[PDB]
mmCIF file of N, CA, C and O in Angstrom:
data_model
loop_
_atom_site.group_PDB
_atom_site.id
_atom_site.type_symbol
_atom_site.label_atom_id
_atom_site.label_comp_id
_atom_site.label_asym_id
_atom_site.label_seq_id
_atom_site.Cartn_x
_atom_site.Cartn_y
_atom_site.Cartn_z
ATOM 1 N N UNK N 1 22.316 -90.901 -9.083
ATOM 2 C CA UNK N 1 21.015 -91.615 -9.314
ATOM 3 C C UNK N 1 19.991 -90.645 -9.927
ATOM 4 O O UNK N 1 20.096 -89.429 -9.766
ATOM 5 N N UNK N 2 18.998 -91.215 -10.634
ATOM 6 C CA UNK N 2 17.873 -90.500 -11.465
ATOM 7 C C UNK N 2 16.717 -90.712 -10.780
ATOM 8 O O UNK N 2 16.317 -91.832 -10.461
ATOM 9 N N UNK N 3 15.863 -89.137 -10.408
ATOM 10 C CA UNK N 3 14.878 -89.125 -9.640
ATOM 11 C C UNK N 3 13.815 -88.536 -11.082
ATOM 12 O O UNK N 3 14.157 -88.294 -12.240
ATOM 13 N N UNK N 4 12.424 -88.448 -10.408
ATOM 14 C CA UNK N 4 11.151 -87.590 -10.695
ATOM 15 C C UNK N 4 11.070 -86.589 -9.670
ATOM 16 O O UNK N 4 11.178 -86.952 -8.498
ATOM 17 N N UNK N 5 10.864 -85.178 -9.996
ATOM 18 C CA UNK N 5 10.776 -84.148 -9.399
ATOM 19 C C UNK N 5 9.822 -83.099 -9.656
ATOM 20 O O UNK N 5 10.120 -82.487 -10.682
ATOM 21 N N UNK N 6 8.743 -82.658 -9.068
ATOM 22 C CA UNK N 6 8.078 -81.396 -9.795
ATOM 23 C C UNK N 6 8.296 -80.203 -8.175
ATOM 24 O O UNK N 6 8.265 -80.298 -6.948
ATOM 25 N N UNK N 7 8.579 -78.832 -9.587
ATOM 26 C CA UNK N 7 8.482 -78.715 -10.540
ATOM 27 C C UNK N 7 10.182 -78.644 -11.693
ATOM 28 O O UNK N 7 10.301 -78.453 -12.903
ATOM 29 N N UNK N 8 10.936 -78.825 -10.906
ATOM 30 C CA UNK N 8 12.381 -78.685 -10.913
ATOM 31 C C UNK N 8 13.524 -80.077 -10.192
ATOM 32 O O UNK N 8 13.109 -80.992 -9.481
ATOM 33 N N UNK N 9 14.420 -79.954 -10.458
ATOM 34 C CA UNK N 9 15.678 -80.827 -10.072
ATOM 35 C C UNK N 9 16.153 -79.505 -9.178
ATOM 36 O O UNK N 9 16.175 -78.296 -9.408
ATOM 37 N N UNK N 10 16.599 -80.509 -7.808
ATOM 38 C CA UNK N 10 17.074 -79.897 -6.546
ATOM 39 C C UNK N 10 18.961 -79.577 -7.109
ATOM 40 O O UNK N 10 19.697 -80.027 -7.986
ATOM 41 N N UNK N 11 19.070 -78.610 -6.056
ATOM 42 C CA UNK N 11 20.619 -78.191 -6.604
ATOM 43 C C UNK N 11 21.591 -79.419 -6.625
ATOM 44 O O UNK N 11 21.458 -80.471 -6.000
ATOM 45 N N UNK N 12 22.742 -79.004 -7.602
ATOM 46 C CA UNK N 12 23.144 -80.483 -7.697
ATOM 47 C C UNK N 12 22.761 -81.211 -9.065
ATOM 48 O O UNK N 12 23.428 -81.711 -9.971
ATOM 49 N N UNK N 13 21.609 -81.076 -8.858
ATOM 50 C CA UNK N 13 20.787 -82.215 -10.251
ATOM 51 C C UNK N 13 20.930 -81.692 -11.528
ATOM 52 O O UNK N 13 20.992 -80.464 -11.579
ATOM 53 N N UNK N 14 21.007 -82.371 -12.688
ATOM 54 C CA UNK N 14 20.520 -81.448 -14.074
ATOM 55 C C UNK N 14 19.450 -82.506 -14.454
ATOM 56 O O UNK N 14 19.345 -83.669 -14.064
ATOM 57 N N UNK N 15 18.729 -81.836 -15.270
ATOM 58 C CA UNK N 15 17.029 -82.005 -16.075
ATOM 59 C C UNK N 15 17.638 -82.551 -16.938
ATOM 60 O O UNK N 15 18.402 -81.804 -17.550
ATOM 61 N N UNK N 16 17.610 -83.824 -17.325
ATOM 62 C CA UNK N 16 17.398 -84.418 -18.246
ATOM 63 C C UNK N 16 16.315 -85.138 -19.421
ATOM 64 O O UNK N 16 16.364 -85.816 -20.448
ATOM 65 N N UNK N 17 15.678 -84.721 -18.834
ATOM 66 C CA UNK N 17 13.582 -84.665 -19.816
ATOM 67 C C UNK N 17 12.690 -84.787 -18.610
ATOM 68 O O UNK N 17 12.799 -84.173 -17.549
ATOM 69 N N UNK N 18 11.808 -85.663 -18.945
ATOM 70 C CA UNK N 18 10.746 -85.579 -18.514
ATOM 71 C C UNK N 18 9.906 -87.281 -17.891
ATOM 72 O O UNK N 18 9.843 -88.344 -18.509
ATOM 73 N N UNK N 19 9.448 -86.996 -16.688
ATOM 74 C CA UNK N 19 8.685 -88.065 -16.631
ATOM 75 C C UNK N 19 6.933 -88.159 -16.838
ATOM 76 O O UNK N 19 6.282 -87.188 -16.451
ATOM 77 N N UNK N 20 6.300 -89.188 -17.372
ATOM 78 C CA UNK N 20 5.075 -88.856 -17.106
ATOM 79 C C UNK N 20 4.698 -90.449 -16.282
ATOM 80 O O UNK N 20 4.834 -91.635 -16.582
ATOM 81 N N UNK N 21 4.171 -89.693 -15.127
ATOM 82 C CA UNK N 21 4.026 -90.613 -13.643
ATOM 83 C C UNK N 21 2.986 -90.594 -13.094
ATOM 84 O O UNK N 21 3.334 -90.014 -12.066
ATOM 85 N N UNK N 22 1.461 -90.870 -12.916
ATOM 86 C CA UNK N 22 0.773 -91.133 -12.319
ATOM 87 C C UNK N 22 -0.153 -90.065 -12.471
ATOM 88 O O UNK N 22 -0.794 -89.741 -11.471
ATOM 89 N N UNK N 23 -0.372 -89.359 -13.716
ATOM 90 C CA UNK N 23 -1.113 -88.553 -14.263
ATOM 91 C C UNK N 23 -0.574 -86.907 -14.049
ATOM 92 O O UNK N 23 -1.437 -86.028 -14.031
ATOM 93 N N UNK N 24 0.652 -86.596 -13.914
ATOM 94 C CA UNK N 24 1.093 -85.693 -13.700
ATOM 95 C C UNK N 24 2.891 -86.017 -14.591
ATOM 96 O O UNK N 24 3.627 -86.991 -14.745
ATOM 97 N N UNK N 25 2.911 -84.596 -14.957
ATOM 98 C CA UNK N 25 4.418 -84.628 -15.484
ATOM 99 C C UNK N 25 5.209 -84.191 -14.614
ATOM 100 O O UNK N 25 4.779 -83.424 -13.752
ATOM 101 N N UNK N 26 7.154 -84.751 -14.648
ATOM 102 C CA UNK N 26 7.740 -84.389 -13.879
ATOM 103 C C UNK N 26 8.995 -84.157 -14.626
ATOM 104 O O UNK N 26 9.110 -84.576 -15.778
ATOM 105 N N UNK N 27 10.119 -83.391 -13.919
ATOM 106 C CA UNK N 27 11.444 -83.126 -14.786
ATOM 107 C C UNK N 27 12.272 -84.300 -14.155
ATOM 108 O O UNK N 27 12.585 -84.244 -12.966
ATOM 109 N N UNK N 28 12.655 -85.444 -15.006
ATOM 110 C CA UNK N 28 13.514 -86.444 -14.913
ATOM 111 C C UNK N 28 15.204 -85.883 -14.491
ATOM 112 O O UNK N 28 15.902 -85.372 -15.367
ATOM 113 N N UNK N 29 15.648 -86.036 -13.251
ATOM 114 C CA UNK N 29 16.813 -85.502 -12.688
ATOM 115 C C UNK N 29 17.416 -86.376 -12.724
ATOM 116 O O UNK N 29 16.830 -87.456 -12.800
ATOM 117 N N UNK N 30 19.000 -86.345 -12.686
ATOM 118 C CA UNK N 30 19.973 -86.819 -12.426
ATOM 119 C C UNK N 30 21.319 -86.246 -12.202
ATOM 120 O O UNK N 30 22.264 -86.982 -11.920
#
């Protein structure tokens, strides 16, 4: 499954771009 994460994707995950969410950016994980 694909999360929002700041400032990084937890182990496990790879960064696949970027979210922009509620006035803050995040690294789009999955």
């Amino acid at each position: 499954a694909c999360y929002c994460r700041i400032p990084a994707c937890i182990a496990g995950e790879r960064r696949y771009g970027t979210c922009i969410y509620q006035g803050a950016l995040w690294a789009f994980c999955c």
